[PDB]
Design a protein around this ligand. Structure first.
Ligand SMILES: OC[C@H]1O[C@@H](O[C@H]2[C@H](O)[C@@H](O)[C@H](O)O[C@@H]2CO)[C@H](O)[C@@H](O)[C@H]1O
Ligand SMILES: OC[C@H]1O[C@@H](O)[C@H](O)[C@@H](O)[C@H]1O
Ligand SMILES: OC[C@H]1O[C@@H](O)[C@H](O)[C@@H](O)[C@H]1O
Ligand SMILES: OC[C@H]1O[C@@H](O)[C@H](O)[C@@H](O)[C@H]1O
Ligand code: NA
Ligand code: NA
Ligand code: NA
Ligand code: NA
Ligand code: NA
Ligand code: NA
Ligand code: NA
Ligand code: NA
Lengths: 989, 989
């Protein structure tokens, strides 16, 4: 019988295994003097829910358009009300049956009219720098071809189709195609024409492609230069001029430049150059650098380098995959400002303009092909395109287009085949093609741990332990002896580590120490630079970020796309402030006696001449002394001891005993750089003179006894509960032990190994730690001093249906002015539940006060939060913040804002000030409870209730990176234990 | 130092291990001619949140009451706005640290004033029939004592405290006490004075206690009677008169009555008797029956009996543990009306009035002591009161009070020590005490499987398989040979089985067949008789039942308290209608040729004389013939063949081929009984003449082809989807394959064994069965008949991120009037996910129609729902119900309402009628979707949306009892398979 289904031809094309058709050969993105017209601007746009209903009503001609409306191009069209963004991590949002597409497949028809002057005749082309995921292109009704590879460029010859004067460009874009099966990155699904559309003239006697080869001989200091140039795939006569180096040479010939200044992330020297034929001239920036693997080390210009990296996705909270150039420039500057020297273009090539910026500002770039088949893993990689011969031409095309576009840029030091694509024949074909085309850059691919077709050994989230074994070259052998010998001769990189989701990442210091210790370790790139939050508005008008599930998705992965060091608007998370310190390229170790500091230059090429070294002594009453010291330039990987001026040490010796003072030595930029202004801080170190342990008040005040209340100086206790009801007129609504915090994203992840793979958050829930109850055992007053007395309140804390508990005794004392509080915790019974030992989040106290707090001040670490395995960037000092600024605006609210290492604190409750001192404690202050914080899925869910929630912790657990990778390291875990700790409280009015 | 805590003495008493103090000896509940005054009525009531704040302001005197308000007594005070009900199953709602109580412990002070006339002097007492959980009692300010054992009676001597005229009774009731640790039944926590308070005169020369011994000699037919009577614990002279039996005997002497009619559940003969002393007379109902264990069988009056039981809690949706007498009488009648003959007073003694009702209506009762320590299990039974010597006197007291109150009632055939209390020394002490006090009744206790201190082997939810092994006496041996020999000589009872929560219970038939086959098997009691729903009202005014979590509980167990055969208002669930049939005490097997039926009397004592045997033949057009047949009385456990009148068979032979007709034979009550009216149906059986397989219409109509639509007779298809868009003018919004249903309570429970302990609901979720997607592969028309043609639509069904699917082909045909639909399902790829084979709920079609349905009619099984392992009570016939009555009002909405075995159906959509015929299918019709049904937590969440959701299933899974006990039995599971099935559709206007 005859077929009756609609749209079968459009679908057959969408299900095609082949690369796009009709396109010109893949080439570099080149700055040319050839006439060009950007077609970016307001286009017309019509959306159809599938191919079988996509009109074939002659719309490509642009006449009588039924159903079209304005839409900007470039755009991600779900960012403008056409459908909605959808987020999955691994899972595909359609049935997995390659190459077939779902019936529900948004089809976006795009149309623009433009004018072509005589500059574009006879020869011109149209260039598309990105279409997600399948484009069909018509000009004046003539089909030019199709596009596959959503983050790759395509060019179409319009010679003889372009007409002088008015032209009509039509583009039909399907969201889903066969290509969606190889584009399963962890990120928002976002169809659209999301990068530039450009009309370019191709004058006769021009230059189609250029391949810059600029090597460096670190022994002689010579440059090795060869600039290839071709037209229609054939080498051509062109002249290469490099004025700064007094060079004029033919394209195609290799020359030795007697002396060049080499390119690196640290010193990104670029030489302006032009290669020109009679009809066209291309402008280049040349950076001389050679990449080599030697002695299981990754070396640039003869030196092993340390990669201080991030994984950079392209995302904008309002424009989707369209990242405006000012945002790119700003965020790259922000990276440099936080000591980052390396970028991985996770997991596709960036906008083509990114490359010159990376060359100029100075990043080591891992340029990664647009390939990811992650969603096939859950079926044992059955049907994985990476090993399906039918996909070979498509996957080689992706790699070719990746390599050809960006091959001229000194910042690209590695090519990556893709990400999470399994192992297979087509990856090997992509590697072979790349090695043959460009042997000057090592190949990276983490998916095949045997490393058969790569030049570096790459892993993601390997533990600190396993990294140390790899750093020593003693990891376990591959079964294949030949492959094992190859892999052991390779240097090692963490292409993703210390997953930066929510509160965290913990354990960054432990990785860094290994990076510094073992040459084989190349460093690592944090997952990831940014959170992919998408801005959402309410009638109230407040903005908050949305994540998976906030846009109607049938299947999604929640907030796992908000997992970055900065939010979608590039506002730093605390983890970035900590990261900056962890990777700081100079180490400053200030001497205890304040006579000087040790300075190690951790850079690979530059000396310390770019830095001004500054000291300041701060005390309770502000700065006491400061200035600048002269440091003879210290060579890379060398060390010296710098003397501080004698006045500094004399100041230290003069300090009254127990008077706190902090000496800070800082390395700042001596002059404006391309990425920050003079005075910008790069590295720092401190020495602290600690305040004495606070003296307990003499217990000279007696306890008044009344029917329902007890008074001990400024504290009033409920006789029924034994807990304070006010202190110095400040109402206390509750006081109790805390063992729990509102789970972080990490606490919601499974820690693998052991028989227990409940997330820590679930272990806590099962154990009842979020719902502690207190039983009063007794209240007793005891002889103090000179008629005074102490008050002891004996309690037991546990939870419904549990037999384990802790005995908590509070001992109060007062001389009338200061209140002394001693807390003793003792385990009662075995803290085991569901067959596994219960771990605690904390050993602390929660004070719930019946008034709001306007200001929080403290002496300790800051200004930002710190937990046991974080806070590297929190320095010692005196800090003061309004209550709102004590919080951290994670998209999904969670435990955050603790200030570990606090020696004193002051809360301002209107006209009263509550002071807390004692041996070091963590400080947290919130206008809402832990139960409201845990329940809240988005920041608007957090409502202040008129109270102050004050947390004083004697011990905290670490935060780890268990959402993906290692959990809390052993030294930072918190198993049930006995404890005791002392505090002092005072209210001033 | 000196103590300052408040309320320490009240708390010390609450934490006491001892039974109550001050009470009179435990005795029977006896009907006496002694003056009595019920103090039930409106009392005054004040609530305090804990003992440390409970005022000691002299309120016991009743003068100047500060803070008291009216409250009825008896009451569960959280049922009247004082606090709230709270539901936990196993978990305790307080920290487990016996004997200690939480600080948050509702204290309810109760006060009443009453008048005592000279009838109550010199001697009187106050009787309390239940206080949850700890009472302290004052009369005119004089403390009488305390109460422990919340469902047990306590009596206090008021002689010399009661004053003539006005008296003031004060009762302080704590919700929680040490006793809460032994009262952890799965049920609502409900403090209050929840049963009668009675002032009773104790005239001199009276009778305090009576112990009736009324045995039966089934060989001679003699009664063996001895009636003990005592005053102050000493036997006394009393006269026992039994007029009906011409007896006058002294209390304390055993006599042989020459002939008595024995008592049983079937024939609950009772003889009125009075035992009287000079000062007092007690009225008894005596039932002569002896209980004996012989040949591993539980026998009454010389015969092994079959228990057809339920577990009966005491609950009322508005009054809590207060069950009004009219509700008791009504529900016991409803039980008899559903063939129930046995009750287990789960898990405490009932109201004392229950016992006479059970004697009179006729139930075999397992009278169970108020003891349950279930919450200690999760700690390995550490600190279990059942094995703690400090709790021995408290636990023996509970058993003593249980036994003494109810020992005179013939309906009590077993004493139970308690429930879910572990094993231990104090249970053994309770058993020893009981055996010594009353050797006439076997002891039951499931908690100790070794059965060391019991006389029957009791289990709960043993599988059908394990029950069959136990029935054959081949279960595995106990390690202790002596205990194994004892246990193998015991009969076996399921004290709880076929958990009746939500849709279900499945697998009842398989248990019953074993009960009938194996004498050792005593039968079983369903868990449980009623749902504990608590009525909740909204401003709208609709009522719905609340369950755990609906009342603010910090910890709770959700709808696990709504797990019954009837709802809280005693409205039957379908499971009750099925249960009634499963346990029917006569079996009627109607002959295929309609000449007669086989009749087996399944009763243990009665013959069939109480029944009238009626036949009716029904056809499409109603009743055709009917009448009554005379059956010579058939003895218990005998069998006969009854001839039907010749006209019946002649009617069968005369039927036109393929014309449906149902012969039903019924056993109804020939006369009013005490529990139902004449004509009440007890047993039934059917023989069906099936309609022919419906003829497929001749495919003589062609398919019209248009741009966006196809027409094939009355069906209009969307050319883009291939699915029907209307049939005979009825709009079709969607048509697709179904494999999933909204999980039942059972589907949410874990099926133990295997490596997969995900609940089936979770397996489905993980597999994507709730979110199927369909891809169109092709649409084709093919040669039919006489220019007609068939239309085939080829699809594939799968779900996002899955590689497995099914190929579904629809083949449509029409002669213009009827529509023929053939559906073919074929597995594509292996249906495995997370390492385990995916199971299906169904193989069906969902039609979503764009109009509402008012009426649903069908020929099949009904009227109520039926699933493969249920529907025993759905009989063959013609049924017709409004749409709302097709649903089942489970408290948590869930899959329900399917009518399996349907041969034809008619949906009325206004003025059009949609008819569906074909080989047997299940029918379901709803005004809302499956996703709305699954999301709904309470019935108000179900909103109609203007559509009709029609489900036609070719195969269904069973429902099992996996919420607690066996899941779906193997024969009723539904693994992925290929399938094909035919339907016919027709619309009449
Ligand atoms: O934010 C996650 C991050 O993960 C990398 O790979 C992870 C993956 O997230 C996780 O789902 C799987 O279980 O483990 C992998 C590594 O162990 C991805 O490469 C990255 O793009 C992100 O998706
Ligand atoms: O000032 C030293 C600099 O070294 C670069 O390699 C790095 O990218 C910069 O962020 C900064 O740390
Ligand atoms: O390439 C081999 C590797 O493949 C990964 O996908 C897998 O998680 C590792 O266990 C390792 O076997
Ligand atoms: O009494 C012994 C029994 O105790 C139960 O609590 C337990 O679940 C059974 O496995 C059996 O060992
Ligand atoms: Na994805
Ligand atoms: Na992510
Ligand atoms: Na918290
Ligand atoms: Na939260
Ligand atoms: Na309970
Ligand atoms: Na229950
Ligand atoms: Na359903
Ligand atoms: Na539901």
């Amino acid at each position: 019988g005859r077929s009756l289904e609609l749209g079968a031809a459009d679908i057959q094309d969408l299900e095609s295994f082949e690369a796009g058709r009709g396109a010109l050969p893949a080439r570099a993105y080149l700055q040319s003097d050839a006439p060009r017209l950007s077609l970016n601007g307001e286009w017309q746009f019509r959306l159809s829910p599938g191919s079988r209903v996509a009109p074939d009503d002659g719309w490509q001609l642009g006449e009588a358009l039924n159903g079209f409306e304005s839409l900007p191009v470039p755009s991600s069209w779900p960012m403008h009300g056409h459908g909605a963004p959808a987020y999955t991590n691994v899972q595909f949002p359609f049935a997995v049956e390659p190459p077939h597409v779902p019936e529900a497949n948004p089809i976006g028809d795009h149309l623009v009219v433009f004018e072509a002057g005589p500059e574009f005749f006879p020869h011109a082309l149209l260039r598309f720098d990105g279409i997600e995921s399948a484009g069909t292109v018509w000009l004046n009704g003539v089909e030019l071809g199709t596009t596959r590879g959503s983050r790759l460029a395509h060019e179409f010859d319009v010679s003889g189709i372009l007409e002088q004067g008015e032209n009509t460009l039509a583009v039909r874009v399907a969201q889903f195609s066969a290509a969606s099966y190889v584009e399963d990155q962890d990120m928002w699904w976002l169809p659209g024409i999301f990068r530039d559309v450009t009309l370019q003239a191709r004058p006769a006697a021009g230059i189609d492609d250029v391949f810059v080869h600029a090597g460096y001989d670190h022994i002689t200091g010579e440059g090795i230069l060869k600039v290839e140039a071709s037209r229609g795939g054939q080498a051509i006569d062109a002249v290469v001029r490099v004025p700064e180096l007094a060079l004029e040479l033919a394209a195609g010939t290799e020359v030795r430049v007697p002396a060049v200044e080499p390119w690196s992330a640290e010193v990104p020297k670029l030489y302006e150059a032009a290669v020109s034929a009679a009809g066209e001239s291309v402008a280049l920036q040349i950076g001389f650098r050679s990449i080599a693997i030697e002695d299981a080390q990754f070396k640039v210009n003869g030196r092993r380098i340390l990669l201080r990296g991030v994984n950079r996705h392209e995302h904008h909270p309002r424009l989707g995959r369209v990242v405006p150039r000012d945002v790119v420039e700003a965020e790259l500057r922000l990276m440099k400002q936080h000591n980052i020297n390396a970028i991985r273009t996770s997991h596709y090539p960036p906008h083509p303009q990114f490359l010159a910026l990376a060359d100029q500002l100075g990043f080591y770039v891992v340029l990664e092909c647009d390939l990811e088949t992650h969603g096939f893993e859950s079926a044992g990689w059955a049907q994985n395109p990476s090993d399906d011969p039918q996909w070979e031409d498509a996957l080689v095309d992706r790699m070719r287009r990746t390599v050809e576009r960006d091959k001229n840029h000194a910042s690209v030091v590695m090519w990556s085949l893709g990400n999470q694509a399994g192992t297979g024949r087509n990856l090997a074909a992509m590697s072979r093609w790349t090695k043959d085309r460009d042997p000057s850059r090592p190949i990276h691919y983490e998916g095949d741990w045997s490393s058969e077709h790569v030049d570096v050994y790459s892993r993601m989230y390997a533990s600190q332990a396993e990294t140390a074994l790899i750093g020593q070259g003693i990891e376990p052998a591959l079964n294949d002896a030949a492959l094992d010998a190859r892999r052991r001769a390779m240097p090692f990189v963490l292409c993703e580590y210390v997953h930066a989701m929510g509160n965290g990442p913990g354990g960054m210091s432990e990785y860094q120490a290994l990076f510094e210790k073992y040459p084989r370790l190349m460093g690592g790139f944090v997952w990831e630079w940014l959170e992919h939050g998408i801005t959402v508005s309410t009638a109230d008008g407040v903005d908050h970020y949305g994540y998976g599930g906030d846009f109607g998705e049938e299947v999604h992965d929640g907030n796992f796309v908000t997992d970055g060091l900065v939010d979608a608007d590039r506002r730093p998370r605390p983890g970035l402030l900590d990261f900056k310190k962890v990777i700081e390229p100079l180490r400053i170790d200030v001497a205890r006696d304040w006579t000087g500091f040790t300075l190690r230059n951790g850079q690979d090429f530059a000396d310390t001449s770019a830095f001004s070294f500054r000291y300041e002594v701060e005390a309770d009453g502000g700065a006491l002394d400061g200035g600048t010291v002269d440091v003879a330039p210290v060579a890379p990987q060398s060390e010296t001891v710098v003397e501080l001026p004698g006045s500094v040490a004399a100041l230290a010796a003069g300090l009254s005993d127990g008077r706190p003072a902090v000496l800070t030595v800082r390395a700042v930029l001596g002059a404006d750089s391309a990425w920050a202004d003079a005075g910008h801080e790069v590295a720092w170190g401190q020495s602290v003179r600690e305040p004495g342990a606070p003296v307990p008040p003499a217990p000279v005040e007696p306890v008044q006894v009344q029917d329902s209340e007890l008074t001990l100086g400024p504290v009033v206790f409920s006789r029924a509960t034994g807990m304070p009801t006010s202190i110095g007129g400040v109402p206390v609504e509750k006081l109790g032990l805390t063992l729990w915090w509102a789970p972080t994203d990490n606490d919601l992840g499974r820690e693998w190994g052991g028989a227990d793979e409940r997330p820590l958050a679930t272990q806590w829930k099962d154990a009842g730690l979020n719902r502690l109850h207190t039983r009063l055992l007794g209240i007793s007053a005891n002889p103090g001093q000179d008629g005074g007395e102490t008050l002891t309140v004996r309690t037991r804390v546990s939870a419904a249906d549990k037999q384990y508990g802790v005995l908590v005794d509070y001992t109060w004392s007062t001389d009338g002015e200061t209140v002394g509080l001693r807390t003793q915790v003792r385990r009662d019974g075995t803290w085991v539940n569901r067959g596994f030992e219960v771990e605690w989040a904390r050993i602390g106290l929660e004070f719930v006060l019946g008034e709001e707090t306007e200001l929080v001040s403290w002496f300790g670490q800051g200004p930002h939060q710190s937990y046991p395995d974080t806070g590297q960037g929190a320095r010692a000092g005196w800090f003061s913040l309004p209550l709102a600024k004590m919080d951290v605006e994670y998209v999904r609210p969670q435990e955050c804002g603790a200030r570990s290492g606090s020696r004193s604190a002051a809360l301002q409750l209107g006209g009263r000030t509550l002071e807390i001192c004692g041996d070091p404690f963590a400080l947290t202050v919130r206008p809402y409870s832990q139960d409201v914080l845990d329940a809240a899925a988005h920041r608007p869910d957090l409502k202040a209730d008129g109270r102050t929630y004050l947390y004083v912790d004697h011990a905290l657990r670490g935060v780890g990176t268990a959402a993906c990778g290692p959990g809390v390291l052993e030294q930072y875990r918190l198993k049930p234990r006995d404890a005791d700790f002392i505090l002092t409280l005072k209210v001033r009015s």
